[PDB]
Design a protein around this ligand. Sequence first.
Ligand SMILES: *Cc1c(COP(=O)(O)O)cnc(C)c1O
Ligand SMILES: *Cc1c(COP(=O)(O)O)cnc(C)c1O
Lengths: 389, 387
Amino acid sequence: TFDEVILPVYAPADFIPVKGKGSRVWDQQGKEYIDFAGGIAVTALGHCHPALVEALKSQGETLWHTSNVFTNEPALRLGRKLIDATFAERVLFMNSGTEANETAFKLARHYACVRHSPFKTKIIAFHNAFHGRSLFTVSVGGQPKYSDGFGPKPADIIHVPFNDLHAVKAVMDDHTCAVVVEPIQGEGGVQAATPEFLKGLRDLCDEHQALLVFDEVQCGMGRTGDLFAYMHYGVTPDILTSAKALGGGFPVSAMLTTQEIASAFGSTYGGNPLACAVAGAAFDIINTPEVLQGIHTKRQQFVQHLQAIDEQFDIFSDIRGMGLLIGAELKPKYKGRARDFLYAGAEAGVMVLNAGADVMRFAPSLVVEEADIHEGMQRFAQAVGKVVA
Amino acid sequence: LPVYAPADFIPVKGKGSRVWDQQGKEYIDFAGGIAVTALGHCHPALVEALKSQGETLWHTSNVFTNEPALRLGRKLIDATFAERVLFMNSGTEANETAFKLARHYACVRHSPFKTKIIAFHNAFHGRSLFTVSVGGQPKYSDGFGPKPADIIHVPFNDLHAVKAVMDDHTCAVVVEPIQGEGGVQAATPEFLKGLRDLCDEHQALLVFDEVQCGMGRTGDLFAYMHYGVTPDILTSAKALGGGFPVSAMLTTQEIASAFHVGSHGSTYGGNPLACAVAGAAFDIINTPEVLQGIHTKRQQFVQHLQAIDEQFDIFSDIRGMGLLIGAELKPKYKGRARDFLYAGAEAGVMVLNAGADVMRFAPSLVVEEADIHEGMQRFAQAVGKVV
Ligand SMILES: *Cc1c(COP(=O)(O)O)cnc(C)c1O
Ligand SMILES: *Cc1c(COP(=O)(O)O)cnc(C)c1O
């Protein structure tokens, strides 16, 4: 049915998920799967979490939609929660990570234009970066194969290697408006920024009067075991973007910044009432000491399994990432074959991810039960075993 | 300039075409959150779809399909020229997908140099850098650094201008069959058919932005059906989810095949919860009875607007299609649209603008006759206060 209905932009699994509860999912044939993928780090509280269902139902019988002309109570409440918990003084709500990034990039550009010079236009970004698939965001993204072939790209974007501080210093000048970076490049093989690199970015932005833009669409909202990855590093950005985990499955996103920067464009703008209600309930759960502590407990449970799998099958050269964003890089013998293990995983009843062709990625619910971790990782071990044999 | 609500106008509850704020003041909703809540607030069918799917499955990623998405895709394909659909979150994203597709199709089918996009003055297509550059308001596209190039703007309804700028290096013509933001201006039959013929001649794709005028708004499922002019690509949002963030890009198999695995496009797009709600909305809007009702209701609004002009002498033109209504103000009241809107709010009726000279109405497609009369009596009161 897929090939007959929707554009040839995706190559989906043979099975169709129909129901989810917690970190378990069922297809049309009733086959049960363990979810270590979370729809690519989106369902951070699992499927149909009672508190998120409650919020959806309660707001759903009250008010769904206002235009950006009006504010609404769920948006104001969520805005306040994000402002109180972060560096942010102002928040702008959208629907997707791409839109949040569009907003952040446009703001950095416009801030430079009005506060400094219309010629202050250079955006520094990184190879293997992913920021979305709109023309602008994909051009800021560091994957030419995704940005090629759509006509003239928005100009004045410069790409250098991730974690290469000297390259950044080399390209930055008084005509630079922003540095855009994922504190951890999720799609780009789960590579975390070094402390010196991220700190260095802050110093260079300060020097050249450019804005440091953190894309935390994937690595934000508790993913790393801190509310946002920047908190782990102790490096404060000028602008931050958040989505995916923000709504635990509901299409929602946020752009966070200071009042000084926001004024280039109330403490909150926009935000769908239904979306913000759900994101509010999601925030309330994730931003607790115990949930954040548990993310680190759960990571080591996952990592110990991956270490045991490697001890058995000689398969991983590296296990990396932060919190419940986990990357397992394949050894040279299994290079380029990440998709093979993902497919065998699904056959064994476990849903995993890739991060390029050389890396297995895990992004489960932040509250995934210990029992589900052990069962799912046993399934993945069997899947690995089938590929090896 | 921009219309913003004060601290004492915060909507907290909606029921049908009525809205209440924090202080419990009741409003009649003729705005629909800018033509979004096409079935009113908290419609029982849409609430039921939201709640039931909400207990089952909200989100899988696009490396999976889902039943609600398949069901909705099938319904759109069966009812339109479309053979393939791509689901996204917003009209902007749908337009991004459409414009990228037209560009990529030309690149692979003809030439990497076939890049020109023809768009129109006063057009609105969204607020991403690309979509706002295709949009026809330079004030909204200025000041964000280098714009994506090869976009040419000409006046809406000016066929000769289009003919003049089009060539073998043109990949697309992008147009709203009715320009909603741009003063509620409908394309003439000659103009829109002319666009089809020119796109045929130059092997360019005709892209209809029906984000505002689509999904029943005009009294047809899509505005293109009224005109009898079939586009190569169509975009839909707003009314599609009746308040739930959802959008769709509609095209043929031949065009869709230009995209391969990885060409696009989304994390949320194709969302099981979104598509279930949109399915329920589609099922209600795409019925002869609701679509007939839209024309009945339009005339009820128009008769009130005519009566207001008879008493107050404020309108020079009443236009639009279905329940997308534009009422242009007379020269003596140029630039007063915002003031009539705020006076409306004071009188307990929510209306829109379409530029500083035009009043816009985009109510629920099933707005009750009683709400129409009451709300327009409130608006007639608001007008009297202004004049
Ligand atoms: C997934 C992701 C995005 C894209 O967000 P959408 O919701 O797909 O628009 C952008 N940036 C990063 C780092 C991401 O991981
Ligand atoms: C409202 C509108 C859009 C924007 O859609 P979003 O959902 O706001 O991204 C684009 N084009 C037209 C014609 C519109 O009316």
